[PDB]
């Protein structure tokens, strides 16, 4: 089919959390502005998805629904074909979303007072999942060298020596810095984890969005023993812009860990009964592979436009290329504005809506995260508006 990645769309007054946030922040925002914040695409969904769901509505009843064996096989085939990862269909545990699955993980495998290690700066909900449940947030700050982030293995090893720490909440690819971890880096983290009593919770929700030139590696696929104590969070929501269909595939090899995760899930959120949620995942995996490839190309072209934009108009600001996700990390520190004032500047002067770096942790202070999943023309419009705003700032 013909794929549209050029049509500027409008989600105004449609229930989009992203757009509604924008208007709430700047009621006077211009009608031509597009928000570049929340992680969902400003592209229509795969045509095959839409046709498939419509066709499905005429063949099924919208009552209590669970995953069929075909659905499970389909999920399993996607992991082999796309990630050289062999999973068992009975390793699949469904939740309405990854975040709830992470909260459920904290709740079941740790208690109040226990420590949970997160590598910061990172997707803020990681923090909430931990602190909002009386658990201790143990930060292993990423090392930032000239804009490239790497893991402080020394600190990580030290942290794993504290018995009060019960798990490593890992993000791969890493939102917001866009790091796609190398096998070497993963192997090092592995020895440390295998030497400690830490469980591995690996949020790999962005694993299908890898920029040309790089390759994602499912963390638990590199070692049997590691897998034995790893919970990998995955979904097709980010990959195919369906965070609104409410379906996730939590991969858990260890039968005990898996049953414990389930019993904890059933006493909190329960099993997802969504009928179209399962179906949307199955269709995307079976029929939307080409759409994803086209989408990745556009995303790659966008990160390069953003990078060239700053090199041409405001060199002291840097927007380096990323390895994964469609969220680019932009260093605005040379602008010398305190994050609150910068945010103010961005929202009301440039009417450009990023995900202010500071919300991912203090290490994100001075940075901005731009959502690259939009037509290249929308990105150019936004940047040109920022160009005028930064020039006026002088």
Tell me which residues touch ligand PPG (CB under 6 A).
Answer: 17, 38-39, 64, 97-99, 123, 171, 175, 203, 205, 235, 237, 243, 248, 355
Q: State the Cα–Cα distance between residues 62 and 86, nearest whole angstrom.
A: 32
Check whether 175 is labelled as a binding-site residue: yes
Task: Tell me which residues touch a copy of itself (CB under 8 A).
Answer: 9, 11, 13-18, 20, 38, 40-45, 49-50, 53-54, 57-58, 60-68, 71, 96-97, 99-100, 103-104, 107, 128, 132-133, 241-246, 266-270, 272-278, 280
What values do phi and psi take at 352, rounded to 5? -115, 130
Whose Cβ is closer to a copy of itself: residue 176's or residue 246's? 246
The site partner of 205 among ligand PPG, a copy of itself, none (C-beta below 5 to 8 Å per kind) is ligand PPG
Q: 22, 37 in Cβ contact below 8 A? A: yes
Would you call 204 helix, strand, or coil by DSSP?
coil
CA distances from 233 to 89, 224, 249, 367 (A): 15, 17, 7, 27
Quick one: 91 or 103, whose CB is closer to a copy of itself? 103
For residue 64, say whether it is annotated as part of any ligand binding site: yes
Question: Tokens in use for 208?
Answer: 């299908």
137 bridge partner residues:
116
- Smallest separation, CB 317 to ligand PPG (Å): 21
Ordered DSSP codes for 270-289: -----HHHHHHHHHHHHH-H
| Partner touching 346 among ligand PPG, a copy of itself, none, CB below 5 to 8 Å by kind | none
CA-wise closest residue to 328 among 99, 124, 36 = 36
User: Nearest distance from residue 253's CB to ligand PPG, in Å?
Assistant: 20
Residue 34, marked binder:
no
Q: Which does 138 bind (CB under 5 to 8 A by kind): ligand PPG, a copy of itself, none?
A: none
Residue 65 binding: pick among a copy of itself, ligand PPG, none (C-beta 5-8 Å cut-off by kind): a copy of itself
Residue 164 CB, nearest approach to a copy of itself (Å): 22
The answer to the question of whether 358 is labelled as a binding residue is no
Q: State which residue, 43 or 181, has the beta carbon closest to a copy of itself.
A: 43
Shortest Cβ 172–ligand PPG spacing (Å):
9
Would you list the DSSP string of 142-163? PEEETTEEE--HHHHHHHHT-T
For residues 142 and 151, is the Cβ–Cβ distance under 8 A? Answer: yes
Choose among a copy of itself, ligand PPG, none what residue 61 binds, the Cβ cut-off being 5 to 8 Å by kind: a copy of itself
Q: How far apart are CA 46 and CA 289, in angstroms?
A: 9
Nearest-approach distance from CB 328 to ligand PPG, in angstroms: 12
Q: Which does 355 bind (CB under 5 to 8 A by kind): ligand PPG, a copy of itself, none?
A: ligand PPG
Residues 6 or more apart in contact with residue 88 via CB below 8 angstroms? 76, 253
Asked if 20 contacts 352 with a C-beta cutoff of 8 angstroms, the reply is no
139 burial (CB, 10 Å; 0-12 / 13-18 / 19+) is middle
Residues at the binding site are 64, 98-99, 123, 175, 237
Residues at the binding site for pyridoxal 5'-phosphate are 64, 98-99, 123, 175, 237
């Amino acid at each position: 089919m013909i794929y549209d990645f050029t049509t500027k769309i409008s989600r105004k007054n449609l229930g989009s959390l992203k757009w509604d946030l924008m208007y709430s922040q700047n009621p006077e925002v211009g009608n031509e502005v597009v928000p570049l914040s929340v992680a969902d695409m400003e592209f229509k969904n795969p045509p095959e998805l839409i046709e498939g769901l419509k066709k499905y509505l005429d063949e099924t009843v919208l009552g209590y629904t669970g995953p069929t064996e075909e659905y499970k096989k389909t999920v399993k085939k996607w992991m082999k074909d796309r990630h050289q990862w062999d999973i068992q269909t009975d390793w699949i545990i469904n939740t309405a979303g990854v975040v709830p699955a992470v909260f459920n993980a904290v709740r079941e495998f740790t208690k109040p007072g226990d420590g949970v290690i997160i590598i910061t700066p990172v997707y803020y909900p990681f923090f909430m999942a931990i602190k909002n449940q009386e658990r201790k947030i143990i930060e292993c700050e990423l090392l930032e060298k000239d804009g490239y982030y790497t893991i402080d293995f020394q600190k990580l090893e030290k942290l794993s020596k504290d018995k009060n720490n019960k798990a490593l909440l890992f993000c791969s690819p890493h939102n917001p810095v866009g790091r796609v971890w190398k096998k070497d880096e993963l192997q090092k983290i592995k020895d440390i984890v295998l030497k400690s009593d830490l469980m591995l919770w690996s949020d790999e929700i962005h694993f299908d969005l890898i920029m040309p030139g790089y390759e994602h590696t499912v963390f638990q696929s590199i070692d049997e023993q590691l897998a034995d104590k790893t919970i990998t969070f995955t979904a097709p929501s980010k990959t195919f812009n369906i965070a609104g269909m409410g379906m996730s595939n939590i991969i858990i090899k260890n039968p005990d860990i898996r049953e414990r995760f389930t019993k904890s899930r059933d006493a909190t959120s329960g099993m997802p009964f969504t009928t179209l949620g399962y179906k949307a995942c199955e269709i995307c995996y079976k029929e939307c592979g080409k759409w994803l490839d086209g989408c990745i190309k556009v995303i790659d072209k966008n990160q390069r436009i953003v990078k060239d934009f700053f090199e041409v108009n405001h060199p002291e600001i840097k927007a380096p290329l990323i390895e994964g996700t469609y969220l680019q990390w932009i260093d605005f520190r040379a602008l010398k504005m305190d994050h609150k004032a910068m945010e103010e500047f961005m929202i009301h002067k440039a009417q450009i809506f990023f995900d202010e770096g500071y919300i991912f942790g203090d290490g994100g202070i001075g940075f901005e995260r731009i959502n690259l999943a939009a037509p290249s023309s929308v990105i150019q419009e936004s940047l040109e508006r920022l160009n005028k705003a930064l020039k006026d700032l002088k």
